């Protein structure tokens, strides 16, 4: 009954953001639905998922993200994360560089449905968060 994978954080890594953009996924996941990260339009960023493995090697780990606008499904990306052995120290998975969309028509809030899984389709963690694209920070 000790969970094999504990997903601990999501971080938006953006060198031009004025402050830290982090979710503690060991907390109240419902609260994130009430919050949002602001990204300046057009900026480069990466998504960092922090997690721990406790007992057994996990293979074919995968990070799945669905993006919604106005409740309408507009993007789905899957990222292969890899294989990881148990240890005390957190692992950090980083996506490739992504770009915030740009232009008046792309500005506003988007809802993100995230899932961390593997080749067994285990629901290691599923959570929801929001991203708001603005002209400036």
Tell me which method was used to determine the 3D structure. Answer: X-ray
**Residue 114 vs residues 56, 103, 136: alpha-carbon distances, Å:** 23, 25, 26
Cα–Cα dist 45/60, whole Å:
24
Number of domains comprising the chain? 1
CATH of the domain at 93: 2.70.50.30
**Residue 46 vs residues 88, 90, 98, 109, 118: alpha-carbon distances, Å:** 24, 18, 6, 18, 21
Which domain covers residue 13, as residue numbers?
A: 1-137
Q: What six digits make up the tokens of 12? A: 């938006």
Q: How many CB atoms lie within 10 A of CB 5?
A: 23
């Amino acid at each position: 009954m000790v969970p094999n994978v504990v997903v601990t954080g999501l971080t938006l890594v953006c060198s031009s953001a004025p402050g830290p953009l982090e979710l503690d996924l060991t907390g109240d996941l419902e609260s994130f639905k009430k919050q949002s990260f602001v990204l300046k339009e057009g900026v480069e960023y990466r998504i960092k998922i922090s997690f721990r493995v406790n007992r057994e090697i996990v293979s074919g780990m995968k990070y799945i993200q669905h993006t919604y606008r106005h409740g309408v499904h507009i993007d789905h990306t899957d990222y292969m994360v890899g294989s990881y052995g148990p240890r005390a120290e957190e692992y950090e998975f980083l996506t490739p560089v992504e770009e915030a969309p740009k232009g008046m028509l792309a500005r506003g809030s988007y809802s993100i449905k995230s899932r961390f899984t593997d080749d067994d389709k285990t629901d290691h963690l599923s959570w929801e968060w929001n991203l708001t694209i603005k002209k400036d920070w």
